[PDB]
Amino acid sequence: DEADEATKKQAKDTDKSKAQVTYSDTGINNANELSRSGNVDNEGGSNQK
Amino acid sequence: VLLQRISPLQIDPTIISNTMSTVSESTTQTLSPASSILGKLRPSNSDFS
Amino acid sequence: HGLHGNMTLTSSDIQRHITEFISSWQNHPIVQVSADVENKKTAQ
């Protein structure tokens, strides 16, 4: 998800509907990437509660 | 953007068009090699981010 | 396409024939390269 706003924000800065420089949908199979989120706490458990 | 505002280099795509110096042959159904490469390059576009 | 005994003239057939005629005319060798006006280089 966070990649999508980067491309959308990039398009706004260049004043174009679609941007040449994109952070998403590249040719690289970057399917193992992880990013910080609110599910996991400091002990490795879920934050369902 | 900062690099562009302090660099003495200007990108002028008309150099490519002048060098080719090919007149329009849209009447011909086929595309000449000179006209074909110009279509791929699209010198009209001015975004060089 | 238009081979059976039941022939009915229609605008679609007219358009098809027109397209064939236009393609045949445009694919002629001399028609490919020709002009009524002259460019600067050929004038030179």
The answer to whether A39 touches A49, Cβ cutoff 8 Å, is no
Q: How many CB atoms lie within 10 A of CB B40?
A: 6
C-alpha to C-alpha distance for B2 and B25, rounded to whole angstroms: 41
C-alpha to C-alpha distance for C28 and C22, rounded to whole angstroms: 10
Best mutation target among A15, A18, A20, A22 (most B Cβ atoms within 10 Å) is: A20
Resolution (A): 3.0
Q: Which amino acid is at B25?
A: E
Count of A-B CB contacts under 8 Å = 7
HEC string for chain C: CCCCCCCCCCHHHHHHHHHHHHHHHHCCHHHHCCCCCCCHHHHC
Q: Which two tokens stand for residue C15?
A: 């358009």
Within a 13 Å sphere around the CA of B42, how many CA atoms are in the beta-carbon half? 5
Experimental method: cryo-EM
Partner chains of C (3+ C-beta pairs under 8 Å) = B
Query: What is the H or E stretch that residue A12 is in?
Result: helix A2-13
The answer to whether B49 touches A21, Cβ cutoff 8 Å, is yes
